Amino acid sequence: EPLTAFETFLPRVVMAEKIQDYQDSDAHEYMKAVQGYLDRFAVGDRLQNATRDLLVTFALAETGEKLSKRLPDQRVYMRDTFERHKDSADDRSAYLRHLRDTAAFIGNAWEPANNSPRALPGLEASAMTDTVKLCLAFLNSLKHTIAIAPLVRFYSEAVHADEGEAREKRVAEFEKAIKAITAFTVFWRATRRGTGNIDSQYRAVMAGADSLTGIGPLARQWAEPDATKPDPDVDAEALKKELAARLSDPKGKGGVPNLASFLADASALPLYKISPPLARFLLLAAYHDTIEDPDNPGLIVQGKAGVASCFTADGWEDDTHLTIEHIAPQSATSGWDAEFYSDKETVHKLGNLVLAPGAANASLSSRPWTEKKVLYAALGASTADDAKSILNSSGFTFAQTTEDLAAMSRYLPHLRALGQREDELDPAFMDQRADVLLRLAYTRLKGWLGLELSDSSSDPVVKVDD
Amino acid sequence: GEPLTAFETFLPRVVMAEKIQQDSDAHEYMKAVQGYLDRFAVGDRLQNATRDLLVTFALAETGEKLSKRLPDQRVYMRDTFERHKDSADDRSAYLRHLRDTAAFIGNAWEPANNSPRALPGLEASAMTDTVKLCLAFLNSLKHTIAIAPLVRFYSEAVHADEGEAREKRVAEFEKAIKAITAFTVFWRATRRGTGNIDSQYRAVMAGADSLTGIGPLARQWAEPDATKPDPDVDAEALKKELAARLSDPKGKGGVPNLASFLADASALPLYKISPPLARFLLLAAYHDTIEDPDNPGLIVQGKAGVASCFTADGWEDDTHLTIEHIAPQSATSGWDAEFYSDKETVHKLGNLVLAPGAANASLSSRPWTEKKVLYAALGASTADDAKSILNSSGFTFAQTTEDLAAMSRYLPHLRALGQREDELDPAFMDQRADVLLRLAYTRLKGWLGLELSDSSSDPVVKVDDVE
Amino acid sequence: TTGEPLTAFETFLPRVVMAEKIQDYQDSDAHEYMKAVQGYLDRFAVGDRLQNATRDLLVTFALAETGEKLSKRLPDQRVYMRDTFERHKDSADDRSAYLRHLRDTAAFIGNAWEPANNSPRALPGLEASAMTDTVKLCLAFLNSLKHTIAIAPLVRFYSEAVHADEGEAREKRVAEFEKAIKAITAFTVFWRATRRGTGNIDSQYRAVMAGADSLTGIGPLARQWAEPDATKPDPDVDAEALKKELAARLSDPKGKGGVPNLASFLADASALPLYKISPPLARFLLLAAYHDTIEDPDNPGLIVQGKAGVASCFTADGWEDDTHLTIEHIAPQSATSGWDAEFYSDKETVHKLGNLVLAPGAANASLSSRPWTEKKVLYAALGASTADDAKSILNSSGFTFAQTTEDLAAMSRYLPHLRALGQREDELDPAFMDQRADVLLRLAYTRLKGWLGLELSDSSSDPVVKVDDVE
Amino acid sequence: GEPLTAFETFLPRVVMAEKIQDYQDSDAHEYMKAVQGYLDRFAVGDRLQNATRDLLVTFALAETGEKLSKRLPDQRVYMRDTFERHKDSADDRSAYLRHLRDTAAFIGNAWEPANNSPRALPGLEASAMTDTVKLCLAFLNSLKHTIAIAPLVRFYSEAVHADEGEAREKRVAEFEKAIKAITAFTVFWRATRRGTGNIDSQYRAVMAGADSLTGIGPLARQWAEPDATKPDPDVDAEALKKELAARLSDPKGKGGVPNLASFLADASALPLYKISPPLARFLLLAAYHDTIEDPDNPGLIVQGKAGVASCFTADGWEDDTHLTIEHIAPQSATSGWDAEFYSDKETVHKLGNLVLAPGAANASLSSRPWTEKKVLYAALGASTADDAKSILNSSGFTFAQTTEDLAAMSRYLPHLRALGQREDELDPAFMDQRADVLLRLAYTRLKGWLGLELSDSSSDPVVKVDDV
């Protein structure tokens, strides 16, 4: 098997310490850690793939990167940018520290080992807050590896920082950073058909350039080797405002200038087919602390804080109680308005999606709305007794026992709401539903990015396309 | 048809004062409480739930310690309702308080069948990891007495103005929950029975015999009438008061220094007394540990975040972290008979590990010689090393190599035991218990403001709790 | 893994690293302090020099942390080192101050005691002001005497001066360091001047570090207690405590220093061949004695205190000045003509303080083995105020010396003890040198006395037990 | 046969006071014998003449601040003039003579000690002879700054006359404060000006002063206008310090140096080594003291740990062999070197081009290409002689001296280590940056001696002014 660009770099990291002779040299503790992470992968492709992917994100993190997957190209760069630190002792030290930090992060925070939780090595478990846990989980699910580079940067700084006040400040900044990255990615991705090359945006941020804000590079060092000015990993506005603008500024390639355009873009796409993880993240954002709408029978509205909370790491992980389920079946089925199957994409838009217990699926699948209405009313009941009363009160006999479905019952307003809807369901209604949902989601993620799009609404609004 | 609860008897009474005036919003607080009770089936469940709601209510409004009997419950409600016959806003905040205790018991303490835990009116942020872990633990322990003080801090967090005020009171709620939990853990770990902890909490609520300058924790005074406001504080008041109740010679907590805590806890069959308590202690102990390079089979604190388990997740993780006995619970071969001199030996902290529950089929009643390989394997960094270890050994276990390797996880305390070359005796488990109880103490210490002297015997009475 | 033994320090390094599971290590405090110690050892070549340097660093370390005389043997050092690090397993800050202490002793040995090849002496972390004239003179002398035992107590005061807050705190501890250095030095000089061999001074210092038979109320001087565990604090204090403890050890009937009054000091010192025992000690005594002296108007061969600053030699400069102030014997070391045979009855006579002068070293070629009659002119000349009078004196004499008149005049300098001897008309005998020694030892005592807080009885005769160090 | 010095002419004039009868006078005799003592040191002829007239000159500055000429008849007078001022009082013609004793004492022991003796302050303990005092005396003497004698005698005289214990010590510490202030003032004035710029004139004013910028009056013992209504004394701690501080640094003053920018600009520009090698040396020692090689600007230095590399000391001053002033760009046009350096004949002599290096090595450094000088500095500045060997051998070069030999002269010297690390070629621009760094560090070190605090405001308020 071919030697990875990593093992080719170790001799180079040994000719470069004179002689500790190492190990006792520092590199050999940072470098041992990285080895620790790679040892996790079996010789052959897994070891190859893991190493080249570690190096790729490394390049983005030390300089805006875009280092290719090909091996000879990686053997360089490692060479290139170590020679940059031939002279200084402490600077070929911080560099290697940086490589340790990216392996630390990928291995523990991004893709933890088989049974372990997620962690930020060197940072306490307090740092591993609920929001941090939910974003890591989501970004990973989306396979958004590009987000690793900016994240390592804030992690690296949190570790290196002095204990007490310094560490905490940088830890809180890490959360601010993770939120901003996530919200930006969600908004960009919800509002576009494909990936629309988000990656290209992130690299530009890392490297700097095309900076909508006054802000400079996010990588550790400058791509142009030499120094006249410092480089700062700051997120309080810097990441936030820069990303905010990249999405929402006419000068930016994010084609989303106001609320009405966001709603129009997202409403229109088959989000479930594009990215089930994204659909799920949006649904959780939307349904969190909602209550059935007293005036619009199908709909929901924001309610008491903590009354129906799902927008959490636990909620993300909870496939068992909160599975994505289609209201209008994915396929033409009787008991349903044919309008829904004009466009193959209709059934997959946010408005048609609910979160329901996964087991019930056997009873919900391909049934007329008449049947589903009872099921949602039941599955959304406050006690299993009410579910029992609802299910029996109905004439229907479902695929599962009354006793069984009642067990799966839980307080879920969006389900209760749909159960109360007396009027028939059509694509027009799902569009209204999507609007309601996308608004609530926006209201929840908005703060993460510092967004405040015009809800001038038509008046002083230009419904713009990307 | 069946006999009416002391709750329904109270609603007429809440209406003759409403008092029309569906017309009254007080109905809204009262409607909410009804919401919670409707959850219980007519008969025993409805009766039990209502009388338990009222009991904690009494402690929270007053230190009353209201009995289980029904006629005695009809009485309180009228007793302490009339107290608020005159003022409009004061029979309002009172009812608000009853709403808050039902809100709390129903959502925070014992949530509905498939829902998470919540603090109604407080955001999901308030539902922090530590808050979630303590609620989970206290519930598991069935420590219902902790509800009364907790409602009090909840109630205040709700009632507080948005923004700065709410957050301050929310942070205080966490401080409070930690202090209550640490206090309960320390008290309970260090005593044979329940040692009447309850009596301590009620005293705090009232609270009699306050070691610190601090006054009652309930909403109102048990002696009906007012000259001064009622304290409801924690940042020292609850913390220091509880700290002292455990650790002060004047207090009934018989634990004056570290050496005595270690001596008391080391000696008890904690697993038999309270498996929940054993588990909470083990999680505290093992959190961010690394195998000891000098004392084989022992552990020491390590890098922050390297092996964290002291979390809500860890508490809930029965699948990866099950309590397992090192020396089998019963006399079995491959094991020193020393362990079965005292039927309590096997159940002391030092003999307990956290391991994946599935493996149990392979660990059960096996000689140490084997358990050593199993722990070494189950605690491995990769499943490849687990394979390497299991195969390397001669043994064939109840489960396939492939299977056990799958259960591998990085767990230093297991790695540590796998490296131990010397035979295991009760002397070693006692050393183990010492190490563990110290780490636990180090972790819970901050929750209570504790700082017991460890003089390493330096000027140290090793003191027993006093009959 | 090459050749000869691995030093205790290297063995210890692995242990110092295991003790830091959580953090760093590089970030670790230890591998900053420990890098510094490495700095000092790197100075020595592989083999004996590296071995010797390391084991000696560890020895003084032991005395300084716990007043324990750690042996030279390696296995004993590997162990001594582990023992007392495990004492600080638990606390972060306490295995930190401990390592700081090891840094401080290497800092001190390397810069203050035996500086690098061309560098001055320094107290790392302390300003150059701290490097006062007296500090410089004592370090120079103690080093010359090879009094390595003094390193342990000295590190202790240094360590505290560094660790102290800037401004008032640092200065107070720096001034205490000088007080300390004086006391150590004066005590060592008095003990050693008054005894035949080393009389085991070392044993005294170790007792102080540990002490342990403390004549004063004073407790240990080491950082920590040899008996591992703590109930009470330990002080490195110098002025309230140190002078007094040392003072008593020399001068108290309960103490092993056998020197209870002035008359016994004078009797003990007068009698020993100090120059043979320790030329450095003789030199330090002579400088103390001759400092600010003037020829005695009433006794021809002798000297008395004079105006402040008139003829100062008791200084770092004076100590270093081998060129102008070399120890020279008045009666030649061997039987030579022109000299009374009395001087060679006892082989030790010629080497007692009274027979020693400080003179320019070059002149030696002209002074060597010459009759007194000549040496008299030479001293009179070499001690002259101007080189003109020196020429006046040398020419005025009939003699032709080994060096030209012009040459010797060039070395002429104002030196009363030389002027005084040149005026002595009466012949020189051992009786006269004894009187000389008395005068000298008194002046020395008067100068060093303050350093130690001493005030010995000169009452006697009226009341003088002239006591011997034995019995 | 040669003319009688104004001193011997003054003894007849002195005895009349006692006059013929007493001691006689015993006190005066003791004082005279002491001054006579000092003069006896000089050979009859020119040396005796010169020494006596110079003793009298500084005496005049110290007693009346009068700038007495070198000519003899003018000296026989003033002596006469100012003794008749004390015809009446016994104790006042006593303190006067005491003052003359003190100036001879000072010149003879503190300023120019006898052939092999150390420096001393007669009547003051050896403690008084502190390191800073020793370094300043040594420097001022080297600079030939005889004008500084007058103010210094004044503080000495007062330290002697003062009661033992508290009084003496206070006046002794004041003598150090005084010596620092005089020295710093002289260094700053002289570093910043082309010629001597008549510093002397400044000092005289202070003694008689006279044109005071501060409220302070004369520094001499007595008033030049003979008669008394008020006492004359100056504490330096405010007075000498503040007065001198202002004379250098005040728009009203003839010192044309109002801020840091102007100081740096003035000093950077002058061929200091050619103007005054002693001054260059004093500045270099100030600058290099406790420095460490700059991690960002190679070849540059920055302040470091206290006591890591101390050279600003009496020992350092005297240490010619270890710390000799050496030019980086050779004094003359040589190959291996940028011709830029020889545009202006003065360039090579500016502070930035000067290092302190062991004097013996000179045989290996002289007129060599930089490429070599770089290795040599790196080697000579090494921490151990092993590293010096490592460096010298590691280089291809063979120098005038053996590797073994040069390694021996090795000493820890950051400014040398720093230059050894410099990869970029050397030009006049670099030496200017170097001079800036050095002059700043020197300023930071001497600043406290004078109570100075010049605006480093310049980017905010640069100015900056020239002198005159």
Numbering used by the authors:
A (entry chain B): 334 to 799
B (entry chain D): 333 to 353, 356 to 801
C (entry chain A): 331 to 801
D (entry chain C): 333 to 800
Sentences from the paper on this structure:
The crystal structure had four molecules in the asymmetric unit of SspECTD.
Notably, SspABCD coupled with SspE confers resistance to a wide array of phages through unusual mechanisms: (1) SspE is a dual-function protein that exerts both N-terminal NTPase and C-terminal DNA nicking nuclease activities to defend against phage infection, and (2) NTPase activity, including GTPase, CTPase, and UTPase activity, is stimulated exclusively by 5′-CPSCA-3′-containing DNA in vitro. Here, structural and biochemical analyses reveal that SspE is preferentially recruited to PT sites mediated by the joint action of its N-terminal domain (NTD) hydrophobic cavity and C-terminal domain (CTD) DNA binding region. PT recognition enlarges the GTP-binding pocket, thereby increasing GTP hydrolysis activity, which subsequently triggers a conformational switch of SspE from a closed to an open state.
